[PDB]
Amino acid sequence: YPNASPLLGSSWGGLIHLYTATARNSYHLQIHKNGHVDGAPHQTIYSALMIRSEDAGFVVITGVMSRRYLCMDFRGNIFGSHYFDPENCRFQHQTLENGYDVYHSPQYHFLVSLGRAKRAFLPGMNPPPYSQFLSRRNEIPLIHFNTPIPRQHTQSAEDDSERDPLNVLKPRARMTPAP
Amino acid sequence: YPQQAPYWTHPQRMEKKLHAVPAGNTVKFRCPAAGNPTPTIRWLKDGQAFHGENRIGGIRLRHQHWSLVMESVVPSDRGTYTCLVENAVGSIRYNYLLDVLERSPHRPILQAGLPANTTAVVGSDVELLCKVYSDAQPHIQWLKHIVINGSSFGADGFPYVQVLKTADINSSEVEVLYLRNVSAEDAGEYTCLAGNSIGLSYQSAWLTVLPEE
Amino acid sequence: YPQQAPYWTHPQRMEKKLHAVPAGNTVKFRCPAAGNPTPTIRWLKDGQAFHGENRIGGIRLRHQHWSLVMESVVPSDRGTYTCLVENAVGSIRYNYLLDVLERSPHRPILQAGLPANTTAVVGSDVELLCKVYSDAQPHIQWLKHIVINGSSFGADGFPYVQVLKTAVEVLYLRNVSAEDAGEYTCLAGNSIGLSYQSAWLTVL
Amino acid sequence: EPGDGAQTWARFSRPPAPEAAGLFQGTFPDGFLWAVGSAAYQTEGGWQQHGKGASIWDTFTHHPPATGDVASDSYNNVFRDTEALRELGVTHYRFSISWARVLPNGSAGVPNREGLRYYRRLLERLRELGVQPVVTLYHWDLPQRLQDAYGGWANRALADHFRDYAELCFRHFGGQVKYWITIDNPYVVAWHGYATGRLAPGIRGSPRLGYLVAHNLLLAHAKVWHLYNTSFRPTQGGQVSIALSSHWINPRRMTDHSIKECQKSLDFVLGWFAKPVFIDGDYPESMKNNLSSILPDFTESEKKFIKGTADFFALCFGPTLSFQLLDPHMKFRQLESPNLRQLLSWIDLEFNHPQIFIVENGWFVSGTTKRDDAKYMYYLKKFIMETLKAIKLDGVDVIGYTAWSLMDGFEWHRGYSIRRGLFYVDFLSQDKMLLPKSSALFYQKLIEKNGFPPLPENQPLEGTFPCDFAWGVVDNYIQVDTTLSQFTDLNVYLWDVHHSKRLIKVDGVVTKKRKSYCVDFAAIQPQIALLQEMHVTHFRFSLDWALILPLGNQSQVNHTILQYYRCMASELVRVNITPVVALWQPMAPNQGLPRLLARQGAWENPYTALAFAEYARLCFQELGHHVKLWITMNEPYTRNMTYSAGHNLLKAHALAWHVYNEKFRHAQNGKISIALQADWIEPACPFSQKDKEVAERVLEFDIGWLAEPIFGSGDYPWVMRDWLNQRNNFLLPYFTEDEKKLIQGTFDFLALSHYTTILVDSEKEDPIKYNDYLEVQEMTDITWLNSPSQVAVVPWGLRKVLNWLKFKYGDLPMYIISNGIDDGLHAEDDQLRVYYMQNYINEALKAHILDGINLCGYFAYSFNDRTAPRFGLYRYAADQFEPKASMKHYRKIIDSNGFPGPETLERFCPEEFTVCTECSF
């Protein structure tokens, strides 16, 4: 008799990816710096989210790369904002009876969905597609989250008369006072 | 009849790279193909031949429709699959990733005995912990009962409660409460109240200060 | 060119009159009453109009055999399923029943900490407790470990069967002394999976 | 086969592991050919002596200034040339025979007996010394009789004239010479000789002429090679090749198009001649396609005539082609690099693993450079190292190395404006004696040691650091946030204990705030948790002057900020991690001062030193109960601060030390001193006296400026005063007797911060990168490891700067207050940091044990990657701290307390009395 015992309930603040399906294709909720929200086909460092609950049932989704907060507007489309508000940038999480998580703004009555069908939420009716989310633990190594952007390209002093190509001479930035 | 290479019959229904369903659902692994003529499809799991011998509970046989049905998917079913059907002139295959997840539509269950009936000497460092378990995001709050006016009960039989530690955006270690140099007033019933979208559950413990030992 | 009083396609293959599908198990109901010209088929439940918007999950209406499918069936779908197909003249009515049994989307979890540490002597016997949260009564076992080569943390499987009762549950470790030690478990399980919990259970 | 070497960039795309490539220190294989090069126009001189003919160079320089009539006077000086070879330790002398010298009047004429006499005397001298010769038949000096009559190499009738001249060379100088080079640098002879006009024949005709001439060079070389093979090789056993110069090129954006474009450039400059000689006999397909018409075609008989006409691969990788004479169009818009290890691998893969003989290498220095050429020595050192890496790590079959230009001479089109010689020649002098340079002494020692043998000074030392050693980490900018996360809610709520488990706030009754302890700060505990995992004994952090006193004066104080610092210091002591606090830190937008104080001069006004004394007094009163190690200045910028600013900074430190010494040390038994950035300064040439003097002078301006008043004589360093006084720069303030006594002994320990070492050269190679203030030419040893920020990994510098501080300032307790390196990437460079940490700590261990240095602390630089980016031992990604590989290895050093051997253990030390810590006073 093999023993595994995988503990249930470890997602109390860890990195999660929101997964939704529609019988056509899968998509992971993703937040970009420019506020664009779309669906990543696989797990991306951009799609890594950290849901945090403030009240007994209300959660806020941030994302650790864009440094933004998943907010919402009157039409029902979602976006990311660098500033937090408790009015519309906060959604009441609700686990459906089939095991799927749906997020909707408490005062906007519109479910958070990866599609463009922003419909109202009622207890027990066919929700819009791309809305039945499913939290997935982040299996992406966190080494990739570091920004590799410090890339340098040298154009000055690049000609056909270079005298020190291997850069033996490296002067140091020293100030010289002058009376 | 030309001997054309096998190809996907319906490429527009193959974009679901990853399958994720709650434990207990049935996944659909469908991949119509072609050939000279259409050959048999033998699914194999991560290399090992996958059929109805390694998992009892129902595996529907659909070969004329070229699909695989996985009824009552259980935690022990994660792993990329393959639509490996071999033709004489062509060899096509598309991976079908499945990641079943285990849900918990329940109120946050706290570890029994945490916090415990721990007593500390006056001037010592006591620490109260409440291990909470809930897949949905819980809100952890630490409460202390007060005797503000008369007894500890309020207007309509509600015990007075003052919040010590909360779970905000930038507040971690919420499930641990630190009480160093406990005075006489640092004694009473500490309840760790945890709740999520399903419900709220609290675990209460009593801390008593001993002036002598 | 006679009138239209047709029958279905497959008599025995269609009607089953009973479907005890577990929760989350996909099932579909078919009413292929063909004819010439093709009639119209309507599906309704509990005497009310049935669409694809009033049910969770979602249903799909096929036209190859004129059937609706239910991916991820739910307990809320209980009731009656009457399909009504009417031709130009006359009508045909069929009935279907559905009582989906509850199947939780998780293996039966139990409150942590339990079972508590066993530390007692004769006179005050150990009252080991393990409460499991589930809809119905799940399978709960204890699985006392057989002491061979200190078998408490190893590999290659440790099958040590020990059955007292399966069905909040409590155990009465009568006459607790220094002869039964080791680590104790609460093997709570169901169809989805099996779970157990343990702690620093050390006894004299 | 062509195209095999296109994978070269793939192998070198991944950075090598800085463990085997770090302390590489290999030894060249036995039988290696250590050679030194020379020419017949660069050095020989005597353009009309003894009936000598007229080269195309003798007419190019005169063009009928900067001419090679008598360049090095080597024609008349045979004894001084071979004496240099004897004292160089070299085993091969690569020189060339002047075509117009041996055969002035005509190839089918009377050989010049005196011209032949010079070369037989040279070879007789080479035989006596044991130096084997490597004769180059043609080194760009074609007779003028063959340029104005047959038109030069553009004619195919010069193959017979070259063959008749080669037979004269083979017949005469055949019994002693076993290595022949037919034509040296055929690319420069062809492309720049006829297609550009920048070289000996002034033509500038067209690229058609350059490809026609190179067509004749291969035919002329193959005509000569088959002359040796069928007539002289059986009775002589020598070898003949062609010196194929090349460059190295790098992709622009690292794409498959760029890699093919890079291979297209190499085939255009190197496969142009190597493939017709080494592979099949025809040009590469890359250059046969685009310019199919302007490039001449090869007959089938000719193609098999040139196949295999080279007994070894002769490579000329120096400043001739690299960056100077390479056609820009031949680069195909790519990046040119002077990489020799990658080029040697490219030759090995593409040309079926040939026996490579590097017949010309090295770099150049400016023309106004005497015996001190440190830039050229380190280019030679890197280039020699690259072949050793190619031999050992790449499997390349390199059989010899030739350091070019045994002596200074006429450097072709550049004239005398550059110098490539290992031996200095005074061109203006009438004697022209060979004076060994810095590279001559370096090359001689490398040949004697046969490569880079391991040194005892770099062998790791197995030993244990003393007890109560200060194993610590630093965090200059701790993250401060006075966020009260515990007991911060004061209201009284109701509780639906049975109904809904919600809180109903009662309006009207609230409680009073509990005593605020140190667990109410949400960020202190996570930081201590990481430090507990590192097993560090000490933690070093700096206070923010602009935060404790926002307006500078003591009228207003931010008590909440002080409470965070006091709580951070109190929690660290609770977990047995001694805090080390720095009062002031220069790294800030306002120089670490409050905005009000930073407006006036920010260090110029003496009131700033006074205002720091009171600020230091406030810090000792609040934080001092828990902090027992104080740092007054935290590595001030000795290179970026003015003399007046450094004058008040010394006074400010003295006031803070005298505040602590008189008022607080009795109540709180702590210590206080100054932290100085002690980066080692090493002379570029190890045997140059003027470089040692320059190294000491720079050290005074860097370390001794702020250490001599405190740790030494109480006044500014003598060398610093001498340098400024003789410069008529009297900007260094003088120390009065009261000030001198004030700062004379304001130290409890020597806290130094070491990061890297810098090589200093007295001579100015170029004035742009020359520090005219200090008359120093800062350089670096390119063979050293480098971080992505170009910081040299020099472990032995830490041991050297520790000994210098002990020698200059006595036997003081020395703390390594900060010593760490950065990693630009995520995990590809952290294996460097563990190498950096392991060796630097080991060299600090060497200084402690071998030199008896009173070292009592090592502080790894940076606590996490969030506070100090790129330097931390903890990776900060997605608002999460993850330990790096350097952290785990650092913890192993801390737990073992140094580097214990296989079987050695020190017992527990209770109340050990090394004089660096707080005893019973």
Ligand SMILES: O=C(O)[C@@H]1O[C@@H](O)[C@H](OS(=O)(=O)O)[C@@H](O)C1O[C@H]1O[C@H](COS(=O)(=O)O)[C@@H](O[C@@H]2O[C@@H](C(=O)O)[C@@H](O[C@H]3O[C@H](COS(=O)(=O)O)[C@H](O[C@@H]4O[C@@H](C(=O)O)[C@H](O[C@H]5O[C@H](COS(=O)(=O)O)[C@@H](O[C@@H]6O[C@@H](C(=O)O)[C@H](O[C@H]7O[C@H](COS(=O)(=O)O)[C@@H](O[C@@H]8O[C@@H](C(=O)O)[C@@H](O[C@H]9O[C@H](COS(=O)(=O)O)[C@@H](O)[C@H](O)[C@H]9NS(=O)(=O)O)[C@H](O)[C@H]8OS(=O)(=O)O)[C@H](O)[C@H]7NS(=O)(=O)O)[C@H](O)[C@H]6OS(=O)(=O)O)[C@H](O)[C@H]5NS(=O)(=O)O)[C@H](O)[C@H]4OS(=O)(=O)O)[C@H](O)[C@H]3NS(=O)(=O)O)[C@H](O)[C@H]2OS(=O)(=O)O)[C@H](O)[C@H]1NS(=O)(=O)O
């Ligand atoms: O408006 C709005 O709102 C909005 O607006 C705005 O906002 C927007 O805009 S924007 O721009 O902004 O964007 C818009 O957009 C919108 O929208 C939104 O929202 C929406 C919604 O709305 S709401 O209302 O909802 O809210 C959404 O939407 C969605 O989507 C859309 C889209 O998509 O577009 C839509 O839709 C529509 O359209 C579509 C289209 O698409 S596309 O692409 O085009 O575009 C679609 O479609 C169409 O149509 C259809 C129809 O028909 O209808 C089609 O299709 C579909 O379906 C189909 C079916 O077929 S049929 O024929 O039927 O029809 C499919 O399929 C296929 O096929 C099939 C068959 O074959 O049949 C298969 O099959 C399956 O199943 C069957 C049956 O079963 S049962 O049960 O029934 O019977 C089967 O079978 C089985 O098996 C067998 C065998 O085995 O053989 C059997 O058995 C036998 O035998 C046995 C033996 O024994 S043993 O032993 O062997 O076993 C015996 O026993 C027995 O008894 C016997 N039996 S019998 O029967 O025979 O007697 C058995 O039994 C059986 O059974 S079972 O159970 O088992 O099963 C088979 O097998 C199966 N299979 S498996 O394997 O899996 O199972 C399948 O299905 C298939 O196959 S294949 O291969 O072919 O593939 C298809 O697929 C579908 N489609 S897909 O897509 O998917 O493709 C057609 O086709 C189409 O067309 S096309 O062109 O495309 O092609 C759809 O559908 C429509 N709809 S409907 O209603 O009509 O449906 C819409 O809208 C929606 O949707 S829905 O659906 O929901 O509606 C959207 O998205 C949104 N947007 S956002 O933006 O927001 O995002």
Ligand SMILES: [Cu+2]
């Ligand atoms: Cu459940």
Ligand SMILES: [Zn+2]
């Ligand atoms: Zn030098």
